[PDB]
RNA sequence: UGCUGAAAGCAUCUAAGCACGAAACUUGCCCCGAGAUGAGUUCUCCCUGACCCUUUAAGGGUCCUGAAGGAACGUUGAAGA
RNA sequence: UGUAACGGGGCUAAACCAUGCACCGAAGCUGCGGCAGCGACGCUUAUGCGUUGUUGGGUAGGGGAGCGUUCUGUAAGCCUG
RNA sequence: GUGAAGAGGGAAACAACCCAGACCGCCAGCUAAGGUCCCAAAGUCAUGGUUAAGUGGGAAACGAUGUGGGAAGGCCCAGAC
RNA sequence: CCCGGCGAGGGGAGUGAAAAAGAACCUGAAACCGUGUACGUACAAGCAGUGGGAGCACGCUUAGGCGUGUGACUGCGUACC
């Protein structure tokens, strides 16, 4: 009789080339969360257990639109609080597809819970039509 | 048939379900009263021209049958947090449903 | 969940949940759209008609 | 440090734009590294005989002139917790 | 002593102020169940059931009400090898 | 203003300190004051200015050929810049 | 009677209602334990939850959403006095 819909594992994945990369980046990196969860595919389980498959194409184009770009740092200090620090900035690090300047969903599923199983389902292969290493069947 | 009933129950838009209503203030254990209180029930909800709500009242009444919910199902919780210690306390209520629309 | 079925495709038609609802509520018999609109999950192919009813002035 | 040259006929490294630069940021520097569970892979080498059991895409289970091989196999040792 | 003043991520207008509008929406009044206290009613009255009003977190005090391992008693009374 | 023998929704996580606010139920409705692109569950709505700085969640003693809205005024085509 | 250390303990007989009366003589749970039917599972967070539910060791049903517990997802939090 239930209104609920578990597993669902995963019933709606919408295989899409996220061309919005750079040319309206900071509008839709903010809402890649609400895409994996929702806004079209919201019709089953828009909060719990689910998975998605969005198609990556480029990475070093962050665009980002503010003074922030050449003076905002990122920090990991991965061992013993670092001590000796680091100071590269956003349009200088984005040259490399790493872990903090390119996924976006890092900051929107922001701890690890619910995110703990969906790290590289989007592949993060980067290099345009020369690098379509994604799904062989027909992506949108 | 697609009820217009809502008081303690407005899930109940299903044709049979089963789904709950109220047990009301007075006698609600008597089975039936055989009379019919309603006819603003549906129209396009049952036909080849579709609507999501109450536009019509199509010839099919709803009988007064509050049924036989007599064994005491699950009802009660308690109170403790700080020194708030109540562990009987709970004056009773319950829910019930219709006897099965013969139409 | 339940409102998903009246916004996911209806978005590209501009019929946006929060902003449609002022138009709709101008009719005093059309109040309870909350749960009763959920039939839209299977009903799509003849549910497409529903928004014609007052469009002249509604849209 | 100054180049053209203006904001404001002036004066001028900046405004629009350039070219270099240091324990410094970076960086195939030096040293380990998916044990970074994102779970990727090149290079090179190696296995193809018969079948059974239903509660079937879930599997469960046998038997092949016994192969080349494997660690205890006799003392250790170079590391021996 | 790990950038650590909204919890983030900083958003070039999504804002910042004024003017329209409908969604979210604590235990917050509503659906409609049950009802302990002190009051008013229809009558009843040994008294009580419903209507009507005030309303239902409870260590200082005073009200005033439920039940037991069984002892001393209900009972050669009825119960059970 | 009822503070705890009051619990947890308020104004930041200043149990007290603005004050009326919970018995106990729902696959049911919503009230304010925080907001309302987000982890986060409703408009990239319509309708008017400002703003072009990363301004918003660091001001106090001053500054300044960058601009913005308003009403008076000075100077100027017998020639003021 | 049978094994083993010319032992300890059991596997059947058996006085016996009984060895769950067997001389570490009480007809008898408690602090803690061993092999197992299935779980969750060698990326761990926050009194180890009651929720909300997939299907799993097993069980009933002329099909009828239930009789069963560690508890994938995560939500709620601070149980004391």
UniProtKB/Swiss-Prot annotation, chain A:
Pfam families: Ribosomal_L13. GO terms for biological process: cytoplasmic translation; negative regulation of translation. InterPro entries: Ribosomal_uL13, Ribosomal_uL13_bac-type, Ribosomal_uL13_CS, Ribosomal_uL13_sf. Keywords: Ribonucleoprotein, Ribosomal protein. The keyword Ribonucleoprotein applies. One of its GO terms (molecular function) is structural constituent of ribosome. The keyword rRNA-binding does not apply. GO terms for cellular component: cytoplasm; cytosol; cytosolic large ribosomal subunit; ribosome. It comes from the Bacteria. Belongs to the universal ribosomal protein uL13 family. Part of the 50S ribosomal subunit. This protein is one of the early assembly proteins of the 50S ribosomal subunit, although it is not seen to bind rRNA by itself. It is important during the early stages of 50S assembly. NCBIfam families: rplM_bact (TIGR01066). HAMAP family: Ribosomal_uL13. This is Large ribosomal subunit protein uL13. It comes from Escherichia coli (strain K12). The lineage of its organism: Bacteria, Pseudomonadati, Pseudomonadota, Gammaproteobacteria, Enterobacterales.
UniProtKB/Swiss-Prot annotation, chain B:
Keywords: Ribonucleoprotein, Ribosomal protein, RNA-binding, rRNA-binding. One of its GO terms (molecular function) is rRNA binding. Part of the 50S ribosomal subunit. Contacts protein L20. It comes from the Bacteria. Belongs to the bacterial ribosomal protein bL21 family. This is Large ribosomal subunit protein bL21. It comes from Escherichia coli (strain K12). GO terms for cellular component: cytoplasm; cytosol; cytosolic large ribosomal subunit. One of its GO terms (biological process) is cytoplasmic translation. This protein binds to 23S rRNA in the presence of protein L20.
From Swiss-Prot, chain C:
GO terms for cellular component: cytoplasm; cytosol; cytosolic large ribosomal subunit. GO terms for molecular function: large ribosomal subunit rRNA binding; mRNA binding; mRNA regulatory element binding translation repressor activity; structural constituent of ribosome. Keywords: Ribonucleoprotein, Ribosomal protein, RNA-binding, rRNA-binding. GO terms for biological process: cytoplasmic translation; ribosomal large subunit assembly. The keyword Magnesium does not apply. One of the primary rRNA binding proteins, it binds close to the 5'-end of the 23S rRNA. It is important during the early stages of 50S assembly. Belongs to the bacterial ribosomal protein bL20 family. Part of the 50S ribosomal subunit. Contacts L21. This is Large ribosomal subunit protein bL20.
